[PDB]
Design a protein around this ligand. Sequence first.
Ligand SMILES: CO[C@H]1[C@H](O)[C@@H](O)[C@@H](O[C@H]2[C@H](O)[C@@H](O)[C@@H](O[C@H]3[C@H](O)[C@@H](O)/C(=N/O)N[C@@H]3CO)O[C@@H]2CO)O[C@@H]1CO
Ligand SMILES: *[C@@H]1O[C@H](CO)[C@@H](O)[C@H](O)[C@H]1NC(C)=O
Ligand SMILES: [Ca+2]
Ligand SMILES: [Cl-]
Length: 496
Amino acid sequence: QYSPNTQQGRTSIVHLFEWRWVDIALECERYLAPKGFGGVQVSPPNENVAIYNPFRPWWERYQPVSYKLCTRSGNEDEFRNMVTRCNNVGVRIYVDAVINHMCGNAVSAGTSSTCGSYFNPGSRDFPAVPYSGWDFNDGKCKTGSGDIENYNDATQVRDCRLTGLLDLALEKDYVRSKIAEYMNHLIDIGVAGFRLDASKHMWPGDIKAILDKLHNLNSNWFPAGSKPFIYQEVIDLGGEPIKSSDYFGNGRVTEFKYGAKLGTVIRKWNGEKMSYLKNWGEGWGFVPSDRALVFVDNHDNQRGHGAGGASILTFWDARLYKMAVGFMLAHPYGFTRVMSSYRWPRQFQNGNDVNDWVGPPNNNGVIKEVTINPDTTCGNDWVCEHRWRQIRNMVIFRNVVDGQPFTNWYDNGSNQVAFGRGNRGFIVFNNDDWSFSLTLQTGLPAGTYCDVISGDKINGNCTGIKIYVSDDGKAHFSISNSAEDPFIAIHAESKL
Ligand SMILES: CO[C@H]1[C@H](O)[C@@H](O)[C@@H](O[C@H]2[C@H](O)[C@@H](O)[C@@H](O[C@H]3[C@H](O)[C@@H](O)/C(=N/O)N[C@@H]3CO)O[C@@H]2CO)O[C@@H]1CO
Ligand SMILES: *[C@@H]1O[C@H](CO)[C@@H](O)[C@H](O)[C@H]1NC(C)=O
Ligand SMILES: [Ca+2]
Ligand SMILES: [Cl-]
């Protein structure tokens, strides 16, 4: 479960949210491979309901119709082409597996699906799988509505419909088998692992039973006996009976407390300050590092659709976002996932975004290609956070310091902190409303290092800030609170 199966040295995966297969494949070859990214989490590759009201919202992909690899991102041939091209370049693919449910019970019957498959939610008929009434929890769920109504009852959270979504009877070997058939088809294609959507809504034992039916990774790309990477999405902010710890026997779990807390800290809410990050990790009530999948924001909470609150930092908060991501990437806790999104017309009304449903950039419903600008940014409204110099260099920073311990922590008792990773890297943050100018112990060998936040090491020179480490590991750092990026990061590979 617990190993990403990334190519030794690569320590992060990027969520290319709503990206088409052809675009990801190209991205693997032209960027992800050279820039050292470990892998890519793709949007659900299985056929979903085509929702026209509202117009093709991103969430329509979380409403399965069948397991055919046929979506707005592409067909099976295009999917396999992507997985092959990415794998050949040492970049892995992780599937967002929507296996807890099919579509909303209120969806009209017909062929309004991404591959034209017929389906009848009212009669529990999904002939493309095939699933029937006997494959759903309608008779198992004990709530008066048939939907999840109270999260204090761990049973209904698993047996009832999540927001009306037809709940599959995962206890049945047949259902478990159909899911494994889908997942094994993906594995044999070359996928390295999966994001198990809505795992909180599935019994740990049912997930286990499904996992027991999965093959090992494709032996053409991975060593024999490689088990697929499994990260279960379990939204657990505490306060509820269901604990993500119940799922440790299956693989890793998403640690949503990570981004929720990091956001409150960086935004300085409730008296929170960066100096408190000294004991970041399990010390904050987080799951064990080796069982955590961390991220600042995800596809849900970046638009207020999951959990984390208004504290979640997103690309909209570029400056603070870059700092949060940088902290995350520098800190040894958990396996890191970088978000990559698309811009949408956020329109807040009475405290909520009325356009939180808006799907990816499109022309009449057809997702737009990802275009690359000369400055390496993306066009067509794709944000491409993973391409931002500050984020991309921190992804590399993580690879360079991999395995090194958390050391040489410094803090001013307020919001100016710093720490290193063994003798391979050092990072400094200034989130106070005043300047930071001080000599700190870096733990790095003497020399001149390029700050990878403000610049890059190119042709034996630094394009941005330069840091001079003395013979007794010390270096002077100066960061104004008005600096473009109020943080500096240096490592073994940015040394001149
Ligand atoms: C009547 O309820 C409707 C809702 O109003 C409508 O917004 C939508 O619900 C949307 C919901 O708002 C979205 O955040 C998203 O919700 C999914 C999240 O993206 C995903 O990360 C998740 N993790 O547990 N669980 C959800 C199911 O996979 O996908 C569902 C299904 O598309 O479909 C429901 C059923 O038709
Ligand atoms: C670094 O840049 C300077 C000019 O600013 C140049 O003299 C020097 O040769 C460059 N170093 C390398 C290794 O190219
Ligand atoms: Ca369920
Ligand atoms: Cl997630």
